[PDB]
Ligand binder design. Structure first.
Ligand SMILES: CNCC(=O)N(C)c1ccccn1
Lengths: 237, 300
């Protein structure tokens, strides 16, 4: 059944599972035409498929050519997502295939279930959590590889960098979701927090800066402040 | 015109014959039903006064044998049986006829309701859905589950309707996932019509039989089957024009006949709203849409 606050630690047990987020698959800019009508222009997108225990991110880049000559693109995007997730699963050795796939949006349930009919033992689940994975394109290195792609491409990342050498996967996921929630609520502020101190750099093979344990506590506090504030600024409190 | 005699009526019971019904009192000198139209299947059905639980009954065709009803005090129900001695049967019926204890199947001459509800229903197909090969007639009751319900527990007593499942490998061609799920024409026309049912008449017959078991016995799995077979047609973009026209007539007469007060349980809101207002065939069921809107606008 659905994943929620009550069964949260299940994410960090030893049953392989993946989150799939489709919110950045079909992306457009909306603009005026010379005749003064409105049109859209697609830009490259991505499927966000994440193992929350290990941090392994399977970033399937969706190049705009996949939309050429197609209709009802927002519907197609869900089915394209499910096609690519099913292909990923089939590409993995049996012992690496997930036992559950959790979709962040309920409209992915039927597309994914249908594409995974060959895998009756893989549970496809929704979630009641409001996860901030749409903000993945606010991570500079992820946005860069998506925007530069000239063809369909899969790129592999660990979204936890080396954090698991020092913290558990529960704590790493909590840090990830805090960072992403902040980037979603106020991207400029969030990014200012992460980079204000030029002596803390991002390793070439990492996504986030090389904070010490003590610096992560300061950073994490600053992201909470931001979120509560924006929550005031937004609601006036 | 054929006859189904009753040995007696030892317990108070409401007796149905097709869309008609009589309340028989405990030990009411009553001895069966005459003037039953030849050429159609028929259903004789029962609800005891002391236990409105379990409606049950028998599908039959008088061309296939001489059938009668006899109460069994051990099993506690009215049982259909075949009389193989034809002279014994004619003699019984004639005596019963002279005693004026046999009700006359009360068909109005103008009235094509039963034909319209059973147009494609054949006894031979009923007997493959309801498996009990030593009898020529078929028992159904309120509690019997379908083969598909059992999958999700006694198989001898199951309704072996054709399994329809929209999220199944049978329904979905590898590589056409989105196409086959959003437009079920492949599944309707190739898998089901050409493959399993062979023709639309057999498909409609199973649909009509499922409705009738839903209506007369409150059989929940039958209701599920009826709606699935409707939904499979309505969710196909490509349906033969003769099938859509016949479907509209079939459904019109089903909706017309349904008891006004059972609509809440026998009609699935999602399927009907999808079929009449969203599906590919939303504009192909004019008669059905008009009667639904005028009789059950709440559901919609
Ligand atoms: C529901 N009446 C059953 C019936 O036809 N019979 C028993 C009868 C007919 C005429 C007068 C009395 N009984």
């Amino acid at each position: 059944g659905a994943m929620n606050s009550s069964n949260y630690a299940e994410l960090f047990n030893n049953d392989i599972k993946l989150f799939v987020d489709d919110t950045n698959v079909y992306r457009v800019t909306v603009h005026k035409t010379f005749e003064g009508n409105v049109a859209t222009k697609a830009i490259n997108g991505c499927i966000f498929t994440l193992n929350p225990k290990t941090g392994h991110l399977f970033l399937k880049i969706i190049h705009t050519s996949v939309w050429a000559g197609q209709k009802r693109l927002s519907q197609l995007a869900k089915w394209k997502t499910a096609e690519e997730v099913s292909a990923l699963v089939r590409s993995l050795p049996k012992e690496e295939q997930p036992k559950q796939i959790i979709v962040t949006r309920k409209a992915m349930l039927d597309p994914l279930e249908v594409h995974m009919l060959d895998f009756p033992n893989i549970a496809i689940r929704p979630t009641e959590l409001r996860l901030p994975f749409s903000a993945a394109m606010s991570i500079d290195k992820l946005s860069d590889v998506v925007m530069k792609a000239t063809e369909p491409q899969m790129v592999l990342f660990n979204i936890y960098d080396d954090w698991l050498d020092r913290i558990s996967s529960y704590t790493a996921f909590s840090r990830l979701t805090l960072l992403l929630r902040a980037l979603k609520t106020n991207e400029e502020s969030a990014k200012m927090i992460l980079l204000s101190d030029p002596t803390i750099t991002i390793k070439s093979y990492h996504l986030w800066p090389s904070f010490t344990d003590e610096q992560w506590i300061t950073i994490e506090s600053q992201m909470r402040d931001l979120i509560l504030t924006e929550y005031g600024r937004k609601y006036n409190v | 015109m054929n006859t189904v005699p009753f040995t007696s009526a030892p317990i108070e019971v409401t007796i149905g014959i097709d869309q008609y019904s009589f309340n028989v009192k405990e030990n009411q000198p009553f001895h069966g039903i005459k003037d039953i139209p030849i050429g159609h299947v028929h259903v004789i059905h029962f609800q005891h006064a002391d236990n409105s639980s379990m409606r049950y009954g028998y599908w039959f065709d008088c061309r296939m044998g001489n059938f009668y009803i006899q109460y069994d005090p051990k099993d506690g129900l009215y049982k259909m049986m075949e009389e193989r001695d034809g002279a014994k049967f004619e003699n019984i019926v004639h005596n019963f006829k002279e005693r004026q204890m046999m009700v006359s199947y009360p068909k109005i001459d103008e009235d094509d309701t039963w034909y319209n509800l059973t147009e494609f229903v054949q006894m031979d197909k009923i007997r493959k859905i309801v498996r009990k090969d030593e009898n020529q007639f078929s028992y159904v009751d309120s509690s019997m589950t379908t083969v598909q319900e059992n999958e999700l527990s006694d198989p001898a007593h199951s309704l072996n309707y054709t399994v329809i499942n929209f999220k199944s490998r049978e329904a979905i061609r590898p590589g056409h996932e989105m196409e086959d799920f959003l437009d079920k024409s492949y599944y309707l026309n190739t898998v089901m019509l050409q493959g399993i049912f062979k023709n639309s008449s057999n498909y409609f017959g199973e649909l009509q039989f499922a409705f009738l078991n839903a209506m007369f016995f409150g059989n929940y799995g039958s209701s599920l089957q009826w709606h699935a077979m409707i939904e499979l047609i309505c969710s196909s973009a490509t349906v033969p024009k003769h099938m859509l026209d016949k479907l509209d007539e079939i459904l019109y007469y089903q909706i017309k006949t349904l008891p006004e007060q059972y609509s809440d349980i026998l009609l699935n809101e999602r399927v009907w709203n999808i079929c009449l207002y969203s599906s590919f065939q939303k504009n192909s069921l004019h008669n059905t849409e008009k009667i639904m809107e005028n009789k059950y606008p709440e559901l919609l």
